[PDB]
């Protein structure tokens, strides 16, 4: 490390002492230092109790660390400047050991500015305690085609819709298939040829709607995280679509 | 530096130039003799408060209009003071120079005169607070005066530490162009140094 000292007036021996005292702080800086300068001045007025003024500037990897002290002589000023610079460099570290106690920790305990925001679902929580099923629509079970079902979707502003298919005579549910288009799920999977003709670009889910109970359906919805579950009820034997409502209850659509 | 001089801020809108003449080749010597006349009239008269000095020049003939609150002191009953000022104005290479001595109507609505009085009182023995209080209360009595601020800086009271103090009464919007602000600055000479006094006074606005 190389230091330049720009003294002023009569300060014999201050330059060497300041050089050798400040150059020892290179190991303290955790990043390479560049062009570290020091300046010594003396107050002309004898009325000042601490006439000597010392200033130091270091460029630690682009970060400017500067300090300034007053003293009665060159030696005291240089020593105080060294202590001040050491404290500043300690507060500057920014390496992991010095930035590990401020990084957000745990999952829910403690909150910080950069702590990860809580993931909130669209629905009101309404935990399993008194969740209940307080919405049961049975809008339409008149047979429809894919295009007619899509239009019945669109003006209802509902992502999924349960109807009964024209060609099959079976219950089916359409939903937005994402970027792939739309997706159709039937109680028993059938190919497109048996399905009534359509013009919208859709795809058919190959899996069949399984048979399961109400509590099992709620458990599957909870452990599978889908926006809804379409299934054949075990007791009823017919189609059913459960979705988490906008109040936290489950919306069971039945024929 | 925070606030520019109010007279120069509204020089082209509200206030008027203190020297009135035209010169292209002879601008420099005109300025020289102008400042010589100003310093001569400032040094010659100090008892009576010199409010203002205008100079007008047309070729040879110069008209120096000087305003004071005590015209009788600066003028001679037999013309002795008039003769003195005339003779010392000829010697400034003013060729034919003639003086118009005039009197201010209200010698307490003038910021320069108020600063003059405040400095004169503060010089000898008067505590500064008394000076500002008396000056402000005397300024408010005048009809057209609607605001005043008086500020002094320096070693007030002969102390070892410089201080700045200011007292205001009314409205002093230094940022408003149409409002006219009479500004007066003067340096009082105390045994412990020099004390600066600035006075701003607001008398309505012109459009």
């Amino acid at each position: 490390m190389d230091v330049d000292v720009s003294t002023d007036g009569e300060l014999p021996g201050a330059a060497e002492y300041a050089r050798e005292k400040i150059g020892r702080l290179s190991r303290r800086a955790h990043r390479p230092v560049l062009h570290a300068r020091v300046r010594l001045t003396r107050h002309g007025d004898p009325a000042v109790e601490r006439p000597v003024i010392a200033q130091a500037n270091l460029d630690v990897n682009g970060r400017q660390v500067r300090a300034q002290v007053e003293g009665v002589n060159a030696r005291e000023a240089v020593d105080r400047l060294e202590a001040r610079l050491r404290s500043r460099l300690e507060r500057i570290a920014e390496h992991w050991e010095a930035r590990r106690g401020g990084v957000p920790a745990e999952a829910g305990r403690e909150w910080r500015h950069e702590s990860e925001p809580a993931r909130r679902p669209g629905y009101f929580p309404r935990p399993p305690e008194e969740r209940r099923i307080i919405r049961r629509k049975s809008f339409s079970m008149v047979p429809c085609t894919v295009d007619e079902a899509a239009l019945e979707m669109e003006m209802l502003d509902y992502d999924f819709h349960l109807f009964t298919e024209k060609g099959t005579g079976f219950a089916a549910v359409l939903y937005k298939g994402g970027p792939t288009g739309y997706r159709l799920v039937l109680v028993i999977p059938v190919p497109a040829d048996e399905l009534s003709p359509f013009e919208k670009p859709i795809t058919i889910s190959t899996h069949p709607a399984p048979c399961l109970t109400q509590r099992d359906a709620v458990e599957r919805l909870g452990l599978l995280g889908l926006p809804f579950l379409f299934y054949i009820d075990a007791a009823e034997g017919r189609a059913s679509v459960i979705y988490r409502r906008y109040d936290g209850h489950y919306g069971l659509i039945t024929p | 530096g925070q606030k520019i001089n109010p007279h120069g801020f509204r020089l082209g809108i509200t206030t008027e130039w203190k020297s009135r003449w035209y010169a292209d080749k002879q601008y420099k010597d005109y300025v020289k003799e102008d400042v010589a006349i100003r310093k001569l009239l400032a040094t010659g008269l100090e008892r009576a408060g010199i409010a203002d000095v205008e100079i007008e020049r047309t070729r040879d003939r110069v008209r120096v209009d000087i305003h004071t609150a005590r015209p009788g002191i600066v003028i001679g009953r037999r013309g002795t003071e008039a003769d003195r000022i005339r003779a010392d104005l000829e010697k400034l290479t003013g060729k034919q120079v003639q003086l118009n001595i005039l009197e201010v109507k209200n010698p307490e609505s003038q910021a320069q005169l108020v600063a003059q009085g405040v400095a004169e009182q503060l010089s000898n023995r008067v505590a500064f607070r008394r000076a500002m209080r008396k000056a402000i209360q005397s300024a408010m009595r005048q009809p057209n005066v609607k605001g005043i601020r008086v500020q002094c800086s320096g070693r007030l009271g002969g102390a070892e530490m410089s201080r700045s103090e200011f007292y205001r009464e009314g409205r002093v919007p230094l940022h408003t162009l149409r409002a006219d602000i009479d500004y007066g600055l003067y340096e009082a000479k105390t045994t412990f140094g020099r004390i600066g006094v600035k006075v701003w006074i607001y008398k309505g606005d012109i459009v």
């Binding site: 401020g102 990084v103 950069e114 | -």
Partner: protein, 153 residues
Amino acid sequence: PRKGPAPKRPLVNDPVYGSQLVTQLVNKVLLEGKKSLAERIVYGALEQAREKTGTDPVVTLKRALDNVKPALEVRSRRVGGATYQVPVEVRPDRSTTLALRWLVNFSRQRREKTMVERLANEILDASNGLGASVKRREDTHKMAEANRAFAHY
């Protein structure tokens, strides 16, 4: 942009080709305000491509753009006091801007002795899928794929 998005400048269509894209290209290759020289360079490059291939400049230019147009990129995102290279979807305007910038920059490093010839060769190679800009698109798509695990935030 702390208070909201800024308006966009509606650049005008070209006189001798009537397309927005060539005007965007001449603005990209513009240097020191020498718009006449940039227009000369671009028009000469288009004419060279036309003479070499025999078809219209604009269709092969669009083919080159679609060949070098990216769809996924990687950005440094800081979540929970930690930085990751997150793959991000690219808006169409940004994809077009990146494709044109890559074309110009890579044509500037060619060895065809002239800006017009370098640009013509680069656009032809991009149309045929051989240009260095195509390689840059392949590398950036590969980098987006490699960090797909960080796509959830």
